[PDB]
Amino acid sequence: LYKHGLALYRYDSEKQNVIYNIYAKHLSSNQMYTDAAVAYEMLGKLKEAMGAYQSAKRWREAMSIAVQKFPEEVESVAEELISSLTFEHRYVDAADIQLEYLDNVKEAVALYCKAYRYDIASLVAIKAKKDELLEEVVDPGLGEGFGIIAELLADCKGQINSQLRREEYLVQSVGRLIERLNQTKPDAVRVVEGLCRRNMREQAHQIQKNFVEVLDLLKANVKEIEIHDFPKSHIVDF
Amino acid sequence: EYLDNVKEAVALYCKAYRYDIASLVAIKAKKDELLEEVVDPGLGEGFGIIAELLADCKGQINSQLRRLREEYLVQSVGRLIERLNQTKPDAVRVVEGLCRRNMREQAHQIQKNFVEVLDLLKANVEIHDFPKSHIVDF
C-alpha cells in the first residue's frame, strides 16, 4: 500500500518524501532499478542511484551524477559499464564510453568494426589523426564481417533447399529465418559499400550475387507455404 | 564535435528529445548553467507540443466516433495509430525528464492522459502498451 500512501500526500510534499525512500527500497530488490534510481534522485540520494543506473544499463545517467559529484570514481565505474555492455552486444554505446571517457581510441574503432558502422570509425581515427587504424583494424573488421555474412548466406541457402524437400515445426522454421533476414538485410548494406570504398570489387560482388539469389529463391516458396526486396547498389551490379 | 559550440548543440537536443544526452554533454562540458538556461525551456516546449497533441487527437477521435454513427474517413483511423507509436519514444523521455527536474505535476499529467488516450481506443472497430513509471503512479 505504498501507492495508497503517497496519493493521500499528492499536494503535501513534506510527508511524501519518505515514502519515496522505502518503496524504491522495495524496488531496489526486485530488479526494476530505474524505479529505484529515479526515486532516489527525488530525495537527494544520488550515490544510491548511481549503482542502480549501473545495474540497469543507464550509463549516461550514472556518469552524469558521477562526474558532477564523485570525481574519484569516474574512472572505475565506467570501466565496469563496459563489462555489462561487452556481454550484451551493445558495442556502440560501449564505444561511446570508450571514446570520450576512457580515451582508448583504438579499441573503440574495433567495436564499430563489430557493429558495422565503419563510416563512424573512419571519421574518428582521422579526427584524432591516427590514420594507421584504417590499415590496422578497419580492414580486418571488414574481412571479419565479410565471412560472417557470407557463411550465413549459405546457411539460409542450404537449410531451405533441405526443407523444401520436406510439419508444424517446419512452418515455424520458414518464418523464423525471414525475420532474421530483414534484421541482417541493412547489416549487409554497410558491408557492400565499405568494401567498394576499399576496392574489394569481387567480394562486394560476391555478397550481392549471393544475397539476391537467396531472395529470388525465397519468393517462390512462401506463396506455396511479406518480402522486402533488397535495394541494389548501381556500381557493383552487373 | 567541430564548431566548439555547445549551446547550439544542446538546444538541438532539446528538440531531439535526447535530454538524457543533453544532461551528459553539458556536465562533461562543465557548463551546468545551461541546465537552467537551455534544458528547462526545452522541457516545457516538449511538454507544450506533446500535451497539445494528447488533447488534440483526443477530441478528433470523438468527432470521428460521432460523425460515424464516408470512405475517406477510414484512413483517419490508422493515421492516428501512425503518429501514436511515433511519439511514444518521445513521450517517455519527457515523463522521466520532468521527473529528473522534479516537475511531478506535469509529468503525471502526460502520463495519466496517455493511458487515458490509449484506453479510449478500446472499442477499436496492432496497438502497443505504454511502459508506465511506477513512481508517480497514484
Side-chain angles (χ1 to χ4, degrees):
Chain A
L1 290 173
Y2 297 95
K3 184 176 180 179
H4 184 78
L6 84 160
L8 296 172
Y9 297 149
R10 178 178 174 87
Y11 299 100
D12 194 357
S13 297
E14 182 179 0
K15 298 179 183 178
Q16 192 183 181
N17 291 319
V18 188
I19 304 179
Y20 288 109
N21 193 3
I22 54 180
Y23 177 63
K25 181 64 180 68
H26 182 74
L27 288 173
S28 179
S29 299
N30 290 114
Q31 291 293 321
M32 295 177 73
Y33 296 103
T34 302
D35 285 330
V38 173
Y40 288 163
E41 185 179 1
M42 298 176 73
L43 299 177
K45 296 174 71 67
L46 297 175
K47 176 68 175 179
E48 287 82 3
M50 184 185 294
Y53 298 118
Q54 191 171 6
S55 301
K57 61 88 179 177
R58 301 294 294 273
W59 64 267
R60 298 185 177 93
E61 295 82 359
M63 298 307 294
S64 68
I65 298 184
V67 177
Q68 183 180 4
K69 297 296 181 182
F70 291 98
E72 68 274 15
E73 295 181 355
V74 174
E75 186 179 3
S76 179
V77 170
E79 185 178 2
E80 187 182 2
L81 290 173
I82 300 170
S83 178
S84 176
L85 273 69
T86 304
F87 182 75
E88 289 293 326
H89 291 85
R90 293 179 69 193
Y91 300 105
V92 175
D93 287 330
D96 292 331
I97 294 162
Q98 194 66 259
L99 185 273
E100 187 68 31
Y101 292 98
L102 285 177
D103 202 76
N104 285 320
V105 182
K106 183 189 287 185
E107 195 271 331
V109 171
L111 302 178
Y112 291 106
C113 293
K114 184 69 71 177
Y116 288 161
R117 294 300 295 269
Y118 299 96
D119 52 356
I120 302 177
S122 299
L123 184 63
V124 173
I126 305 177
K127 181 69 175 177
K129 281 79 178 175
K130 292 180 181 291
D131 299 331
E132 67 272 14
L133 291 176
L134 299 176
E135 298 178 355
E136 182 176 359
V137 181
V138 172
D139 294 330
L142 288 166
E144 177 67 29
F146 172 73
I148 295 172
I149 295 176
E151 179 182 1
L152 197 147
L153 297 180
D155 285 330
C156 293
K157 180 180 177 181
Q159 288 177 356
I160 298 175
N161 291 316
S162 66
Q163 292 183 357
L164 177 56
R165 188 177 183 272
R166 184 159 185 192
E167 185 178 2
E168 184 178 2
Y169 180 74
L170 192 64
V171 176
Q172 183 186 4
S173 63
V174 175
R176 187 178 179 181
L177 292 174
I178 192 175
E179 181 180 0
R180 185 177 179 178
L181 293 174
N182 288 317
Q183 181 181 2
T184 318
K185 179 179 175 181
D187 296 329
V189 176
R190 292 169 179 169
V191 176
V192 171
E193 181 175 358
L195 268 68
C196 289
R197 294 183 68 185
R198 304 297 291 165
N199 294 319
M200 296 296 106
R201 295 182 181 180
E202 289 290 328
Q203 292 178 355
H205 184 272
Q206 180 179 1
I207 298 172
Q208 190 174 1
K209 184 176 72 68
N210 288 135
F211 188 78
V212 170
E213 187 178 1
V214 172
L215 274 71
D216 289 331
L217 187 145
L218 188 63
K219 192 173 182 179
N221 207 167
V222 185
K223 183 179 179 181
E224 184 180 2
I225 204 180
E226 181 178 0
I227 298 171
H228 291 282
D229 294 331
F230 178 68
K232 291 184 179 181
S233 65
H234 295 287
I235 295 185
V236 74
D237 183 74
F238 44 86
Chain B
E1 182 67 28
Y2 298 103
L3 291 173
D4 200 359
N5 294 320
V6 180
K7 182 187 283 189
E8 288 82 359
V10 174
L12 289 168
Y13 286 109
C14 295
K15 299 184 77 68
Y17 301 95
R18 300 305 298 267
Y19 299 96
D20 55 357
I21 299 186
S23 295
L24 186 66
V25 182
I27 285 169
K28 180 63 178 175
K30 295 185 263 75
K31 292 180 176 66
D32 293 328
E33 73 271 12
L34 305 178
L35 295 170
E36 298 176 353
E37 292 183 354
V38 183
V39 177
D40 294 330
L43 296 174
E45 185 176 0
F47 175 72
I49 293 178
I50 296 175
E52 180 179 1
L53 182 62
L54 292 175
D56 196 0
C57 300
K58 184 178 179 180
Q60 294 181 0
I61 296 155
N62 207 347
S63 179
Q64 190 172 1
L65 183 65
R66 189 172 181 177
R67 186 177 178 180
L68 185 62
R69 200 153 156 186
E70 195 176 3
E71 189 177 2
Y72 181 76
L73 194 64
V74 180
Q75 192 180 3
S76 178
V77 176
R79 185 177 180 179
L80 300 179
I81 301 166
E82 178 179 359
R83 191 178 178 179
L84 185 63
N85 293 318
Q86 292 296 108
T87 318
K88 186 264 302 302
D90 294 332
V92 178
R93 291 166 176 168
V94 180
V95 170
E96 182 185 1
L98 271 72
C99 291
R100 290 177 66 191
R101 303 296 292 164
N102 65 16
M103 296 176 73
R104 65 185 72 186
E105 295 292 329
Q106 294 183 358
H108 183 86
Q109 185 177 3
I110 291 194
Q111 181 170 177
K112 183 69 175 178
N113 290 319
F114 191 81
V115 178
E116 186 176 2
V117 171
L118 189 61
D119 294 334
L120 186 143
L121 275 74
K122 188 176 179 181
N124 48 7
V125 229
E126 185 177 2
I127 61 182
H128 194 188
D129 292 334
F130 178 73
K132 191 174 183 181
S133 68
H134 294 286
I135 294 181
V136 73
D137 194 0
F138 50 87

